[PDB]
């Protein structure tokens, strides 16, 4: 037969709105991009993705939160010589610091006053401001080491809630509040006026509603505070004399987030009216007169912009923005109006939420804390498990023959026997307290009974017991970004597995002797791994979009000519291939897929010859077929020797900025 | 049946006037629509019916005008795009052959009023 | 509708008096103006009902090509017994 294709649009797995973008390292234009730069994206359903902007923005890790959890602000902290530290507020009274290894909170510091509305990090990163609902600004001593947080000082109180914070330096702390005012406190310890609010400024109020100052930044090249409020106006204030220099009436509704570049020649700003405005001071006359101009204005987002940030280095100068529509947008910093931009896909499934089983023609898919199963026929939803004893979900696998499902999150996992009772299923928990106590990242089913478990604390069990696993050399990037030496992937069928950690290490393991035989042999982050039983091979693909294969018991000649005979589609690819499998009718052809395309490479053929992180910066160290007509893509797989399963996505009020009518 | 005979004759290569005659033979409304729904392309049925309705814009048969109005109802996404060199003057001379009835509908309705008045007063004065 | 039955009978019966009157149009101007403005727009609503009826029977015949299909097409469902076997806290309970 020819390939018959099930273009499924059943799964309505929808992410949530980006509420906070942050960059791990600050800008430093005249030095190279550090190998430890990570962008962090906190959504509104409570999960924190961490992306690396090397070679078109791959996604390294994801830290999910559970039911009724959100995340409103998040800040990085990297004292030079120590590990990265990631703090985040939710809609609650605590700050939550996460250890990047496990993907769990390692500290929930309850701030001692009210519900936190904003968070900011000191310059030199030893103190932390949390601005709370009862008008307080609380200082948290951060420099005690990673994990230990102390209370320092509650600054002088006020009535209205402080909605945004910024620091001048180690010295002063600026805060925009919900009464339309902008206070300036002094956090300079061992002064006479420590903690008391030195100044108050009032923005031009709205006529028929209350005004809220939503975004405040400090501009260090000049000595100003930029501030966006809920009238749309953007004001620049001289810090000394605490007074306005110039006001622009830029947006039509609120200005939720605004940011600046390194040398403060530009200020970018955005809000609910979904345009991004650029205010420039680049002319020598502008710099000697201290006069910003409203330079430009772009309409790129669909609904809102709730978060904006900027990075600028020797081989990277981009501002990143995201909002109520769930996608990310990258623009250039010094070439905003002129240059190009890239709207990311709303999901790039580096961690999958859908898998199928060929027997019973069935497919399982898990959104937040519920799984669902349907069969092909049309299609019919046969069962679902809205387990609400759970709070957060993570990865899942089904037994071949479709008997037992296992769902698993970083706190526990749970296994359910299934029996098809006709037009429905019957699902029963089968108790195992070892599974109920273990942390699981990946479960991948050696047999109908045996599974292999990768724990969040780097343990590899075999249940239904222990694989010896050698240690990795801890270099500076491994001590800086503390999840690089963590097992991302493991793929197995028939007693032979292979694990993969993102330092460029991909290690096989025989399930019998439980010995490594390492084949690290790599240069950067590994996107996907699939084992070919034909050729006795492992197939790794890295973030640079190269396909390597190696043998087992280094790379084959097919790899050796394929890598540099690779097609132009792969050489101009933008979305990384997150899934590989092999064809079912032929044991040697392999069939892979990214988030916007589907390809298939042939095992023997070779074809003839004749807005990124682009610098000389290193990685994290110091017949051929191609289609894209199923581009909003979530997951693909096979069922039998002729058909294919292509499950994708399909689609909210927004500020109407109308197209010209004719 | 005879609709299939007319379909095969009009689809083979030739006999278009005889094809419209065989269409006028059985001449169902439902089969008239079905013969438009079945065929995927026409051999300038619009051209031959254009010249027929141009040479007789006043015929008592409703067959070819019924066929033209159902062709224009069901296939006019493609009659404006099949051909535009002879078809342009075809629709031009068809439109100028048919506009005169729009010019003289008021006088015919006037004469209909005349005659209804005359016949009703003649029925009225009927000599007891 | 109802009253012009009266006006056609007045012309038919009194067909001599108001042909012997010297200024017919000047004496019943309001009838002439009313009928002129009623019958002046007849080509316009001719074009209107041609264009309207064309689309009307166009969707009528296209929907009569499949008019029996929407009588048993709706096979929709709801939160069935999978929800009862789904509630894992209620599965520990009952």
């Amino acid at each position: 037969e020819r390939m018959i294709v099930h273009r499924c649009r059943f799964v309505d797995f929808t992410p949530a709105t980006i509420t906070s973008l942050a960059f791990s390292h600050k800008s430093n234009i005249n030095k190279l991009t550090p190998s430890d730069l990570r962008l962090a994206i906190g959504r509104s359903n409570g999960n924190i993705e961490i992306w690396n902007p090397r070679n078109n923005w791959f996604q390294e890790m994801v830290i999910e939160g559970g039911k009724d959890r959100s995340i409103e602000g998040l800040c990085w902290s990297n004292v030079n010589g120590e590990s990265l530290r990631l703090f985040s507020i939710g809609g609650s009274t605590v700050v939550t610091e996460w250890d990047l290894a496990t993907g769990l909170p390692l500290r929930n510091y309850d701030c001692n006053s009210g519900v936190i509305w904003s968070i900011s990090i000191n310059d030199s990163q030893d103190k932390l401001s949390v601005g709370c609902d009862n008008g307080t600004v609380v200082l948290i001593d951060i420099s005690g080491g990673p994990g230990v947080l102390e209370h320092d000082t509650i600054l002088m109180r006020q009535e209205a809630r402080v909605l945004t914070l910024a620091w001048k330096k180690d010295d002063f702390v600026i805060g925009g509040c919900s009464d339309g005012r902008i206070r300036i406190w002094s956090a300079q310890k061992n002064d006479e006026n420590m903690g008391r609010l030195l100044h108050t400024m009032k923005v031009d109020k709205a006529k028929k509603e209350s005004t809220l100052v939503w975004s405040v930044i400090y501009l260090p090249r000049t000595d100003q505070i930029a501030s966006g409020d809920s009238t749309g106006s953007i004001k620049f204030w001289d810090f000394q004399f605490a007074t306005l220099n110039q006001s622009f009436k830029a947006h039509d509704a609120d200005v939720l987030c605004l940011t600046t570049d390194t040398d403060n020649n530009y200020v970018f700003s955005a809000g609910v009216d979904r345009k991004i405005f650029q205010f420039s001071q680049n002319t020598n006359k502008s710099q000697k007169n201290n006069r910003w101009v409203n330079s430009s204005n772009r309409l790129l987002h669909g609904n809102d912009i709730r978060a904006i940030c900027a990075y600028q280095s020797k081989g990277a100068d981009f501002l990143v923005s995201g909002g109520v529509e769930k996608t990310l947008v990258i623009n250039s910093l010094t070439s905003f109006s002129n240059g190009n931009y890239r709207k990311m896909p709303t999901v790039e499934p580096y961690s999958k939420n859908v898998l199928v089983n060929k027997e019973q023609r069935l497919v399982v898919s898990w959104s937040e804390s519920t799984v669902k199963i349907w069969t092909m026929g049309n299609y019919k939803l046969v069962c679902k498990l809205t387990l609400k004893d759970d709070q957060n979900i993570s990865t899942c696998s089904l037994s071949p023959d479709g008997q037992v499902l296992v769902v698993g999150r970083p706190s526990t996992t749970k296994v359910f026997h299934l029996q098809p009772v006709g037009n429905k299923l019957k699902v029963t928990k089968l108790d195992n307290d070892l599974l109920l106590r273990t942390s699981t990242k990946l479960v991948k089913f050696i047999d109908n009974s045996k599974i292999v478990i990768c724990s969040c604390e780097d343990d590899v069990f075999i249940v239904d017991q222990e694989v010896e696993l050698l240690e990795v050399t801890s270099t500076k990037s491994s001590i800086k970004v503390p999840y690089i030496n963590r097992i991302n992937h493991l793929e197995v069928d028939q007693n032979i597995a292979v694990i993969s950690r993102g330092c460029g290490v991909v290690d096989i393991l025989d399930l019998k002797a439980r010995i490594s035989k390492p084949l690290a042999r790599l240069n950067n982050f590994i996107t996907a791994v699939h084992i070919n039983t034909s050729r006795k091979s492992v197939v790794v693909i890295t973030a640079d979009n190269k396909i390597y294969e190696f043998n087992m018991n280094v790379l084959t000649q097919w790899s050796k000519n394929n890598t540099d005979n690779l097609p132009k589609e792969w050489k101009t690819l933008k979305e990384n291939c997150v899934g590989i499998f092999s064809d079912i009718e032929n044991s040697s052809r392999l069939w892979f897929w990214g988030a916007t395309w589907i390809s298939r490479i042939d095992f023997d053929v070779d074809f003839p010859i004749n807005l990124t992180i682009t610098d000389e910066s290193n990685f994290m160290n110091d017949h051929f077929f191609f289609t894209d007509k199923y581009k909003p893509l979530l997951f693909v797989d096979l069922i039998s020797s002729n058909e294919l399963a292509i499950i994708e996505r399909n689609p909210q009020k927004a500020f109407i900025q109308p197209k010209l009518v004719f | 049946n005879i609709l299939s005979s007319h379909l095969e004759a009009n689809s083979t290569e030739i006999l278009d006037d005889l094809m419209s005659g065989s269409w006028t033979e059985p001449e169902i409304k439902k089969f008239i629509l079905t013969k438009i729904n079945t065929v995927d392309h026409l051999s300038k049925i619009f051209l031959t019916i254009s010249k027929s309705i141009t040479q007789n814009p006043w015929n008592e048969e409703n067959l070819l005008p019924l066929w033209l109005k159902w062709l224009l109802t069901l296939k006019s996404g493609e009659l404006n795009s099949i051909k535009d060199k002879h078809t342009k003057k075809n629709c031009k001379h068809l439109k100028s052959a048919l506009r005169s009835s729009e010019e003289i509908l008021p006088v015919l309705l006037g004469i209909q009023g005349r005659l209804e008045m005359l016949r009703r007063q003649a029925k009225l004065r009927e000599d007891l | 509708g109802p009253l012009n039955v009266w006006v056609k009978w007045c012309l038919i019966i009194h067909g001599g008096y108001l042909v012997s009157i010297p200024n017919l149009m000047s004496t019943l101007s309001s009838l002439h103006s009313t009928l002129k403005r009623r019958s002046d727009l007849l080509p316009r609503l001719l074009a209107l009902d041609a264009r309207l009826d064309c689309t009307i029977n166009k969707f009528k015949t296209l929907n009569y090509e499949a008019g029996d299909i929407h009588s048993s097409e709706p096979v929709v469902e709801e939160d069935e017994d999978d929800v009862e076997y789904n509630e894992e806290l209620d599965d520990a309970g009952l």
Binding site: R2, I4, R7 | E60, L108 | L46
Partner: peptide
């Protein structure tokens, strides 16, 4: 029948999406 022919001629004068699941094919 003249007003009928005239009405029809004048009519001639003034006369002058994605489902949730498909199944298709692609190249081998």
């Amino acid at each position: 029948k003249q007003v009928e022919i005239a009405e029809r001629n004048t009519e001639l004068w003034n006369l002058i999406a994605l489902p949730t699941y498909t199944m298709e094919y692609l190249d081998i």
